[model samples]
Target: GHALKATIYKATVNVADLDRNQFLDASLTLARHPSETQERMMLRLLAWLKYADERLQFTRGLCDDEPEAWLRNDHLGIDLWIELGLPDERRIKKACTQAAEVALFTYNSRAAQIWWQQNQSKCVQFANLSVWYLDDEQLAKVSAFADRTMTLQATIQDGVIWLSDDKNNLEVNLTAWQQP
Candidate 1:
C-alpha cells in the first residue's frame, strides 16, 4: 500500500485560565492523520486550551486504545485523559476505569445529541467521566483558526473560552452532557 502524508501543524499558545488559575505558554505540535479531518485537529488543540497543564501531552494520532491527549504523574499514572468525537460506550467505560479523570468533547450537532441519548444511561455509571459538546457552528468558525504554524492566545473564565490569533477571534462554550 502506498503511504499517505500526515500533515503537521505547530502552535505557540499563551493561555490564561482563570478557573484553574493556570497561566502558561506552550509550543505544541500536532500530526493529522490522512483519515482525520481538519476540524478534529483544531478541536484537539482547543481541548489543550481548556485544560492547560504543563504535563499534558498528545498521544499517537488516531488510535483505538489511546486518548487524544493525557496527563500523567509518576505515581498516579494517567491522571487526566482527554478524548474527542463520539466513541462507543464500551470505550468510554474502559477509559473511566483506567484514568483518574476522563473528558470527551463531541461535535457534529444533531448526530452528537443522538449519540448522547443512546449512551447517556450507560455513561452515568462512571463518576470520573465528563462529556462536553462543542457546537457544530462554533467548531466550524474556530476551525478557521488552524494554520501550519500559529501564534495563538486563549483566555478562559467562568467556563467560557476565548481564542484569538492576530486577525481572527472565536468564543467557545462547551455544553455539559454528563458532569459528575
Candidate 2:
C-alpha cells in the first residue's frame, strides 16, 4: 500500500473595508462559522486561484529555465520518431496544433467568463466546475474535440479522480477537492 501525505496552507480573510457593506456582512457571516465546509471550499478555491495567479504571473518562466532549449527543441524540432515516417510527423503536428488550439480556446472562454462575472455577476467560475454553466453550443464544441466513444467515466482513488485526454494519453489526478 502507498502512504498518503497531506499539506495544509493557511489564508487570512480581511473584512475591514469601510465602503463595502457586503464585506462587513460577509465577515459577520464568516465569523459565525469560521470553519464551515462551504467557507473551507471558498478558501481552497481562493488558494488555488492565488496559486494559479502566481504561476501565470511568470508566464515567461515557462521558458526561463531553458529558453533556448524550448525554442529549439519544443517549438522548432519535429516530435515524431523517424521510425513512424513522414505521415507520422504530419499526424503528430496536427495533434499538437489541435492541442494548442484547444488550450487557446479554453483560455479565451475563461476570459469571457471573467469579463461577464466582473460586469454583472459576483460569482467566479473555476475551470473544473465550469461545466455546470456550459451552454449546448459550448458543450458541442467541447464534445467535438474530446473523445466521446470511450466509456468516459472516472473513479475516485485516494480523494483524486483520474482523467485522460485520449489523443495525448495524458493522465491527470486531482486530489485537493476532497472534503473531510
Candidate 3:
C-alpha cells in the first residue's frame, strides 16, 4: 500500500473587499505531499480567489475524478467544475457535461498556448466553459512569497487582482482569459 504524510504548513487566508461583496475568512492546512507542487498550490489559491462562495470547497484533486476544486448545489449537483493546468480534452468535456459551469485556470502558459493551437476545434463546443491564464513570471513571483503560514488580503477591480500579506504585495495580470 502507498503511504502518506502530514501537513507542513497551515495557511490562514482572510479575504476582504471581494467583487461580490462577500467575506471569506478561512484557513487551510496542507500536507507536503511529494506530488504537490508550488504551481498546484498557487492555482488552488487562485481558484479560491475567483470563486469565493459558501458552497465552494477544495477536493483531493489528481487522486480522484473530482476537479481540483468545486462548488455544488444542495442536491449535490456540481455548480462549478474547476481545473488547473492542462487537462486531457476528454476530461474537461466530461466536466462541462457534468457541471453547470466549468473553468480551467492554466498557469503553464507555453504548454497551454500550444494545446490551444492544437485543439481549437475541440475548444468551441462548450459555451459554459471559460479559461484564465496567469503569467508565468507573475505566478513565480507570487509563489515565491508563499510561506508556512500566510495571511493575506485581496482587492479585485476591473478583472485585476492585487494581493498582499504582511511585507509582500503583488498584482496578478492574466495573459489571456480564454484558452483560445
Clashes of each: 0, 0, 0
Which lDDT tens digits does candidate 3 get at residues 1-180? 554564566667766645677677777655556677876787677667777666677777333587878899999999998888777788878889999998888767679788877765676778788887787887888787578788778777666778888898888776555632
* Worst-scoring 10-residue span by lDDT in model 3: 1-10
Candidate 2: minimum summed lDDT over ten consecutive residues — where?
23-32
- lDDT of candidate 1? 0.89
What would the C-alpha RMSD of candidate 3 be, to one decimal place? 2.6
Off by over 4 Å in 1: 1-5, 61-63
Candidate 3, superposed: residue stretches over 4 Å from native: 1-8, 61-63
Which lDDT value does model 1 have at 135?
88
Superposed on all Cα atoms, the candidates' RMSDs to the truth, in angstroms, are 2.3, 22.2, 2.6
Estimate the lDDT of model 2.
0.24
Tell me the lDDT of model 1 at 146.
Answer: 84
Query: In model 2, which regions exceed 4 Å deviation?
Result: 1-107, 116-121, 124-148, 157-160, 164-169, 172-180
Give the per-residue lDDT of model 1 (tens digit) for 1-180: 544368899999999999998899999999888888999999999999998888999987432578999999999689999998888977887789899999899999888889988888888989998998888788998899989999999999988999999998878888888897
Candidate that beats the other on TM-score, 2 or 3, i.e. the better one: 3
